[PDB]
């Protein structure tokens, strides 16, 4: 069962600022991963698009010749394989190849994809597998080549040998007298958001949402920002994934109007810092690693957008650039993908045809100024630096 729940839009240049749409534009529907755009807005407002996550390494020489290292985490929600490979590269550039005790605190988050001890157990497990495995030359080579494109140098065939990896809480970490402290800054937040909104599992959005205070903080933010409450927008996580079962699902939900208000606000907060939607959201046809990279037709090169797919919904929202100006849009479809596998692709085609009509009946597409960015978790200021 594929059918329209709601479609709405507004011209960026509207003097009335009245959102246009069908009669369902003020009823709540599942959002799926367009939720990530709301999480994006929150993060931009709270942190700023140039914010960097400052992970600290406390490094102490051992009588051996080797090092102990304690990671004081910054809750960087994008510390994954790429970033781990870069850390290893950096350790080798700093002449560290052997670590005796590697320790890490509760703020050191790791994306291989409850409670503090148990969360840290999973990070430890992941770390121990990852650092005890040879770095894959094919994956590293591709990564080193992407890094060189943004002028980041990485080591040749890097490696690390770690004796032990343990959880040490921030409160119980005693900084050694002859430790050095080095900082490994993330790429800017806008870049992390770019990566998240191109294509991701739940991990980044969910960790951002928790970092910022979770649901109680989110509802206070939305009330302050939008004069909105839970009848406009009801979140349970940052990502929009199912928090229930297949039979009784629990999805983030919002009105079509709220999605437009989000896009407007996001656009405004970004412009204040000189940035565009296409700095944090995928560009149809241009962003090849995204869910809209194979979009063609009039959307190609003209459209900034985020996809969503859950059992009960297929969604799209963003901005289309037309000869009549930029236009914010959201389309929310109903699906029953658990019952009928064909619904996601059928829904997706109906959304594209709806957005193509929105473009084609507003004078046709006007290209945006955009060249495919590579949203790596580090940039040229990420190098280990003695702070």
Author numbering: 38 to 150, 165 to 438
What did the original publication write about this model?
Here we show that Bdellovibrio bacteriovorus utilizes a small ankyrin repeat protein, Bd3460, to protect itself from endopeptidase activities during entry of prey. We demonstrate that endopeptidase complexation by Bd3460 prevents cell wall decrosslinking, and that both the Bd0816 and Bd3459 targets bind this self-protection protein via a common epitope. Previously, we assigned prey cell rounding to the action of two secreted Bdellovibrio peptidoglycan DD-endopeptidases, Bd0816 and Bd3459, that act to modify the invaded cell wall via hydrolysis of the structural 3-4 peptide crosslinks. In summary, we conclude that we have identified and characterized the first ever self-protection protein encoded by predatory bacteria—ankyrin repeat protein Bd3460 from Bdellovibrio inhibits the prey wall decrosslinking enzymes Bd3459/Bd0816 and in doing so protects the predator from the shape transition that this catalyses in prey.
